[PDB]
Amino acid sequence: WYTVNSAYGDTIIIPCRLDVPQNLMFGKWKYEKPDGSPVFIAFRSSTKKSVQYDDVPEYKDRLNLSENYTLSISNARISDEKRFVCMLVTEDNVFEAPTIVKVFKQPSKPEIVSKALFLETEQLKKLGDCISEDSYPDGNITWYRNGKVLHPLEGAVVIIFKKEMDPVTQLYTMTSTLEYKTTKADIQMPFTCSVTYYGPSGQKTIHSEQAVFDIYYP
Ligand SMILES: *[C@@H]1O[C@H](CO)[C@@H](O)[C@H](O)[C@H]1NC(C)=O
Ligand SMILES: *[C@@H]1O[C@H](CO)[C@@H](O)[C@H](O)[C@H]1NC(C)=O
């Protein structure tokens, strides 16, 4: 299970992962549908040096099959997250090698929006919505009070999370609503949020700017 990690919008470089055989006739690249059905996308003849791309609109003007059978896909999309197979064909044999492609799109810097004009003591109020957009894969939202993680607590800290996918791009938008019961200790205290996600270089976290609220009490 060899994997190629690519950032959204970059060129995906997929080497064949096969030794060049003696008596090579041609090579072909294909991708597998979710249930394993094959779709051929590129062809290269070793004898004629010709290059042909199958009529697959999803890959129109996006492929380049080099002389050593490396397939390059331009402008990485979420639909490119598939298993690709390099097939080398000789006069009496077929050799196949798969490569898993994973695509990553960095979530937007989170922002606290739809903010309360003021928080009320002994009353649960919607502090705001922490939104992080156009991400792939989805991310986890954490809330903080004075730079310290704010965990849920019955009748005091209620966190309502949702992840929505755009059906055309397959990118995620994460929204975390914080319903909060303030105290006078929150006078001039900053509230922030962050998004934790997996990218090509591993697990990363991006923090938001702070939000300070006027605390009202009877
Ligand atoms: C040879 O393969 C490498 C990847 O292993 C690729 O970067 C290079 O462009 C290829 N060269 C040719 C001439 O196909
Ligand atoms: C998000 O949280 C879940 C647990 O709820 C965890 O399994 C997952 O690895 C977390 N994702 C990231 C990007 O850390």
Residue numbers in the entry: 28 to 245
Please give me the paper's original passages concerning this structure.
The membrane proximal domain of CD6 binds the N-terminal immunoglobulin superfamily (IgSF) domain of another cell surface receptor, CD166, which also engages in homophilic interactions. CD6 expression is mainly restricted to T cells, and the interaction between CD6 and CD166 regulates T-cell activation. We have solved the X-ray crystal structures of the three SRCR domains of CD6 and two N-terminal domains of CD166.
Recombinant His-tagged proteins of human CD6 SRCR domains 1–3 and human CD166 IgSF domains 1–3, i.e. the two N-terminal V domains and one C domain (CD166 VVC), were stably expressed in Lec 3.2.8.1 Chinese hamster ovary (CHO) cells, purified, and deglycosylated. The crystal lattice did not contain space to accommodate the third domain, suggesting it had been proteolytically cleaved prior to crystal growth. We mapped previous mutagenesis data that defined residues in CD166 domain 1 critical for CD6 binding (Skonier et al., 1996a, 1996b) onto the crystal structure. This confirmed the prediction that binding to CD6 is mediated by the AGFCC′C″ face, in common with many other IgSF interactions (Skonier et al., 1996a, 1996b). If the heterophilic and homophilic binding sites overlap, as implied by the CD166 crystal contacts, homophilic CD166 interactions would be disrupted by the formation of heterodimers with CD6. Crystal contacts in the CD166 structure suggest that the sites for heterophilic and homophilic binding on CD166 domain 1 overlap.
